């Protein structure tokens, strides 16, 4: 007789913890599928990994315990609903003209392969919207920065920024929506960059007119009079196009 049972799943690594006397056969049935899938044969109480058996959806699955004629089924609402999502991993890398913040998505481990939990159809299409807490220098007022999903891929999110002082960062993810998954905060990482004048060619959409103004000046000083007008007309069309693309981020 099963005296205690608990199902838990973190980043899709599903485990069952139970107590009972003797050995038992453990099997699982997913909603919509007729056959029970045998997971363990004649095993004693303890904690067992059952990753891969429950379907990753919003419908239920049942874990059945059998010992001779004894039989009991344990109901679970649905893995996409029950699964907990661990914290992401943050890395700070220094470059000659900027600092890169890299947020690696929490991942599922299917054997030896690490599968990022980000918009995968086989993992509830779950993806996290990240918030990063930036600590600059010795400030006691961390800056709250919301990561734009456009800066994220299946692997993680990449944010380039610049400052001349020490910076520490930690990030947290949330899915919002139907599944209200909230992750724990990642560990904090710091980095001290070199003192430098950090500049950019095109800072934002509003900076394009300055880019155009400068390049018009460069063309005028760099090339002979004859090529001036032509090159400047192409600069005009390219400037309009850069603006058009940047407007896609509005």
């Amino acid at each position: 007789t099963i005296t205690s049972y608990k199902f838990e799943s973190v980043n899709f690594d599903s485990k069952i913890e139970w107590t009972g006397n003797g050995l038992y056969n453990i099997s699982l049935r997913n909603y919509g599928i007729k056959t029970w899938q045998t997971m363990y044969t004649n095993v004693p109480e303890g904690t067992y990994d059952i990753s891969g058996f429950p379907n990753n959806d919003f419908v239920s699955f049942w874990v059945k315990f059998e010992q001779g004629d004894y039989k009991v089924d344990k109901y679970c609402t649905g893995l996409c609903i029950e699964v907990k999502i661990g914290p992401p991993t943050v890395t700070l890398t220094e470059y000659d003209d900027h600092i890169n913040l890299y947020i690696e998505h929490p991942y599922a481990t299917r054997g030896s392969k690490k599968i990022p939990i980000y918009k995968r159809n086989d993992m509830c299409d779950i993806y996290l919207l990240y918030t990063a807490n930036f600590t600059f220098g010795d400030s006691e007022e961390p800056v709250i920065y919301d990561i734009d999903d456009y800066d994220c891929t299946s692997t993680g999110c990449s944010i380039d920024f610049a400052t001349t002082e020490k910076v520490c960062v930690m990030a947290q993810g949330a899915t919002e929506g139907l599944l209200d998954k909230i992750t724990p905060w990642s560990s904090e990482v710091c980095l001290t960059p070199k003192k430098n004048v950090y500049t950019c060619a095109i800072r934002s959409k509003e900076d394009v007119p300055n880019f155009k103004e400068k390049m018009t000046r460069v063309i005028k000083r760099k090339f002979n009079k004859q090529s001036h007008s032509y090159l400047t007309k192409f600069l005009g069309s390219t400037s309009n196009d850069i603006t058009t693309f940047l407007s896609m981020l509005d």
Binding site: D57, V59, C80, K119, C124, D125, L129, D146, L178
Partner: protein
Amino acid sequence: MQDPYVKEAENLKKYFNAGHSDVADNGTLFLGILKNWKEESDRKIMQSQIVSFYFKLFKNFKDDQSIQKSVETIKEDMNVKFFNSNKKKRDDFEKLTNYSVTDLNVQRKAIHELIQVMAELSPAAKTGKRKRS
């Protein structure tokens, strides 16, 4: 996508005696509604219900042999225009329309699948959320 479809629709109008000036009473069933929605998605939502209405109506007259050719021609125009001639699409559609709401077993499965259906109405990876609210 042809004159034959119009010809058969007219034959049905005659058969059902739906050509009298008093038929026009009480606005319209589908004309006004179809006029209110131009976005493709909204149109499909409404057309799906109008198409199922017609299939059910035709089903209720599968005995009248005289108009069977007319009905078959109309249904074919719908298979072509609404289902894009995709037999699987039409079969799934018909499967949905035939589920019985009074069948106790069907009811349990429907209730059980409710959360997944809700998740399907607003696809997660498709909801353009870019930043935390």
